[PDB]
Amino acid sequence: TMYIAFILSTIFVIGFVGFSSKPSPIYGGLGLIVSGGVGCGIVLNFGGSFLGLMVFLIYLGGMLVVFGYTTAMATEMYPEVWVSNKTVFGAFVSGLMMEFCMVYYALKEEEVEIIFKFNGLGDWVIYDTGDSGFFSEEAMGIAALYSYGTWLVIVTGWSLLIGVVVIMEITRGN
């Protein structure tokens, strides 16, 4: 129970290795949604309740769902399987071992310098000490989209309407 965010992050990276080794896209999507679930859990452990539930509802139940639906239509006659290629196994194995080596090095050394400097002193350590009062600071920051973020709403809504128009232009096929 002492370490929860680290198992979650290691599983996150494992799922990333799994779907980025690119088996047939249905198993890649399964790995992506496993990664998304554990990442939603990660941000739940950081106090990002609304953001993680957004991950769930819109990413895993929306965007993914649509991805798997579209894969179920444009696939191979025998939709492929993970095992069918030695390349998938090699990529997944290399990614898993580079995960294991670096997490072991960071755990037992705490001063790795792979591009960035890292210290696995813990993950609870960086949390600050204070009271947030009678509201969720995350929800207040996100609800400010309609009061502070007028410009953001304007450009995002315009881009979504343009996205509808754009999709209907491209898919017409003439």
Partner: protein
């Protein structure tokens, strides 16, 4: 009816918030002493732990500024039991 009821629910929330406001100086005064005591206890312990580390100097602020800096969880609970620091980190988040 919903107008009547939601209007009443807003005054009740104001009353609750004012109860909290009245209680806040007590809680702030208590939290200050608690935090300072934890920091000073860590200091007294590290004066012992770090006796033999050669160039170590105990109490040395990581910051250039001498202004008060609110400690992180690591400075507060880094020398206490796993259950206590687990509570101080995730007790609210996990409470359901």
């Amino acid at each position: 009816s919903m107008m009547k009821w939601n209007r009443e629910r807003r005054r009740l929330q104001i009353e609750d918030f004012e109860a909290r406001i009245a209680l806040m100086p007590l809680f702030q005064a208590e939290k200050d002493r608690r935090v300072l005591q934890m920091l000073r206890e860590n200091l007294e312990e590290e004066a012992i732990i770090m006796k033999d580390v050669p160039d170590w100097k105990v109490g040395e602020s990581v910051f250039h500024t001498t202004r008060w800096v609110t400690p992180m969880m690591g400075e507060l609970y880094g020398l206490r039991t796993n259950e206590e620091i687990l509570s101080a980190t995730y007790g609210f988040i996990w409470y359901t």
